[model samples]
Target: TSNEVAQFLSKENQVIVRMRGLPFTATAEEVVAFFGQHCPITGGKEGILFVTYPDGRPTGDAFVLFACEEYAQNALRKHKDLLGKRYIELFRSTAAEVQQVLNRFSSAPLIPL
Candidate 1:
């Protein structure tokens, strides 16, 4: 949910940023590694997401939720930054929109690890 992580994380400090322009093969691990140092990710896997469609295809767009608005704003400074080589797009988004995305993409069947 939009508020499922750390209750304090979603209060007023967090920022959900939309990520796009990644390769179809991009993994949540890569996206997790992509950001941070410049602006740290909120809380690891909990704040990072990779999206896909019902057809079980990657959309090349991901979402990153930061714990602080300042961190998120700093992240925007690196907009168009290279994610492994391809320049990815970053935009400030709302929890609602991010949740909508999760809900929309969450229907795909999971692959066994």
Candidate 2:
């Protein structure tokens, strides 16, 4: 959900930034590790951190949600941040659109851990 974690955690902020130009081997943990430094991540399952996974493959694009608006904004400040020598795109997104993005893969089976 859009800001579901924030709502559950009693925070009224969330951001849906996409990481572009990532390697197929990219993992949610990796994304989290990079952005987690800026703010606390607030969504996703125990180990999964994206909504674009389908066919158990990375789409080079994934959404990021933070616990609060400040965190989201802080992370955005690092837009075009480097990930593995490549510049990954980052920008603000709406919860509804993020939800739509997730819905695109909701029926796809996740890659086995």
Candidate 3:
């Protein structure tokens, strides 16, 4: 996402951000074991990371990993109050869904090595 899109069109560092992950495993258990329950930021106990397979895609196992709690805090800082609250709501609404998402990522053809 970029904020000053047209305003800073050709600027080298126009403030753009992107998040991505590589799903190189066939097992969700392995993924979970690798990421675990660490905050990935504050390293707190209640934090979580989620991985997902897209609704309709065929290929090696692919996933999206999201750092939850610490992500919320980061959002709170990045967008400040209002957006922070919105992010907080997202964390609340989606926390339980994380495992399900990871499960989907565990299915389908996977890269064997």
Candidate 4:
């Protein structure tokens, strides 16, 4: 993530990382390492957005991570590692999907519109 993108993201943008093939025992440290310590803006430490796992299926190997562009860049950079290790597959969602999901989360439902 560049300084501009990182700045924009810190205000409200959200980044979600989805990966398949992550080993069941993969630790968060390993995941963090995949990204790095830079905030991507000031290039410093900023808290991660959120880290999550898919369902508890045995040998579970998937993740849905949320972060700003700073962290997302890290994810993008390390994606190859996951693919190469056959540990996981990763991709970003399309803009439309991002909007749909964001709208779902940010808006309150109205009855009988």
Backbone clash numbers for all candidates listed:
0, 0, 0, 2
Please report how far candidate 1 places residue 96 from its true position, in Å: 1.8
lDDT of 4 at 17: 58
Cα lDDT of model 2 by residue, 51-100, tens digit = 44445565777666676778878888778877777777876676566555
- RMSD (CA, Å), candidate 1 to true, equals 5.9
Sort the candidates on lDDT, descending order: 1, 2, 4, 3
Q: Which ranges of candidate 3 are over 4 A from the true structure?
A: 1-40, 44-93, 108-113
Tens digit of per-residue lDDT, candidate 1, span 1-113: 32343242354667888898998888767777777576777677666666667565888877777877788888888789888879999998876676566666766422221
lDDT of model 1, residue 105: 70
Residue pairs clashing, model 1: none
List the lowest-lDDT window of 10 residues for candidate 1. 1-10
TM-score of each: 0.72, 0.66, 0.24, 0.43
Give me the displacement of residue 6 in model 2, in angstroms: 14
Residue 56's C-alpha lDDT in candidate 3?
33
| Pairs with backbone N, CA or C atoms under 3 Å apart (clashes), candidate 2 | none
- lDDT winner: 1
Instruction: For candidate 1, give the lDDT of residue 109.
Output: 29
